[PDB]
Amino acid sequence: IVGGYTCGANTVPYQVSLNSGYHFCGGSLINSQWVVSAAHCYKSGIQVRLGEDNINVVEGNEQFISASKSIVHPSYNSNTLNNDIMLIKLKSAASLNSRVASISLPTSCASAGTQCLISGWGNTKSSGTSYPDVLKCLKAPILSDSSCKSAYPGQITSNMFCAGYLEGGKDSCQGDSGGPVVCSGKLQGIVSWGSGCAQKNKPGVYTKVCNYVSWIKQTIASN
C-alpha cells in the first residue's frame, strides 16, 4: 500500500497472508474454512496465516493453517486478468474471535463514490522498493465506470472496478494482490492489477466480488 497508514494490530481481522516460505499475496477470510484471493496469486505449497500484524514476528494472535484445496475461477484469463479470483479451503477450521473474524459477502454491487478500506503488506513506494513488516491500510473511493475505462481504454471488463485517486500518490501495490477491498462492512473487491502503483491517471483495478457471490456460495457448499 502506497500513501496509506499503519492499520493497527488486529483492526482488519479478516485479512490473511498467503505464505510459501515468505509472504506473497493477501486474502480474505470469508468463513472458518475458506479464504478468497486473486487467481493470479495461485501457487502450490500455500500456508494461510491468520491474526497477523507483523509478518516477521510471532506476537500471539496467529493461526497458521495449510491449504487443502485451491479453486481458481473456471474462466480466469491470465492475459486480461478477467475473473481474477480464487478460493482456498483450509485443512482445519480457523478459531474465530475478535482478532480473527470473517468478512461478509455483498448482496449488492457498491456505487461510485463509496468509501472503501484496502489493506495489505505490499510495497509502499511508487518508485523503488520498501516492504513493510506491519499491515498498512488505505481509504479510497470507488471510481465511476467511465473514469475507469478512460484510465484503461479497452482493458476494463464488467468484472472489474477502479478505486483510488486519479491524481496518484495513494494506491495498492505489488504484494497487496489478493487482499480485501471492504465497503460498508462487506467484501466488495479483490486487489487485482494496475499500471505501476500510485501513478497519475492509473488507479488500482479490483475484481468485482458482487459478480461472483453465486459461484462462491455454490463452491463452498459443495467442497
Give residue number: closest CB to Ca ion.
Answer: 52
CA 60 to chain CA mean position, Å:
24
Does the annotation place 97 within a ligand binding site? Answer: no
Query: Which is closer to Ca ion, CB of 58 or CB of 166?
Result: 58
In the chain, where does DSSP find H-type helix? 145-151, 213-222
Contact in structure between 77 and 50 (CB atoms under 8 Å): no
3-state secondary structure of 39: helix
The piece of 56-64, 123-131, 145-153, 207-215 that touches Ca ion (CB under 5 A) is 56-64
What CA–CA distance (Å, rounded) separates 169 from 161?
Answer: 19
Query: Which is closer to Ca ion, CB of 54 or CB of 63?
Result: 54
**Does 51 help bind Ca ion (rule: CB under 5 A)?**
no
The residue type at 82: N
List the grid coordinates of 28.
Answer: 480474505
**Does 52 help bind Ca ion (rule: CB under 5 A)?**
yes
Positive/negative CA dihedral, 46, 51, 53, 55? negative
Point out the residues that are catalytic: 40, 84, 177
**Does 171 help bind Ca ion (rule: CB under 5 A)?**
no
The piece of 20-28, 35-43, 55-63, 76-84 that touches Ca ion (CB under 5 A) is 55-63
Contact in structure between 100 and 50 (CB atoms under 8 Å): yes
CB 68 → Ca ion: shortest distance, Å? 23
What CA–CA distance (Å, rounded) separates 10 from 161?
Answer: 27
For Ca ion, the binding residues in 77-136 under the rule CB under 5 A are: none
CB 133 → Ca ion: shortest distance, Å? 9
Query: Which is closer to Ca ion, CB of 59 or CB of 167?
Result: 59
Does the annotation place 175 within a ligand binding site? Answer: yes
Name the binding residues.
52, 54, 57, 62, 171-172, 174-175, 177
